[PDB]
Amino acid sequence: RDCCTPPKKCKDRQCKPQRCCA
Fold this sequence. Notes:
It is classed as neurotoxin. Keywords: neurotoxin. The assembly is monomeric. By secondary structure, the protein is mostly loops. It contains no helices and no strands.
């Protein structure tokens, strides 16, 4: 589980300032 690995998880502040989320 990661900010963008399936299932993506950019629904977090510590996983949003990324290049795969923002």
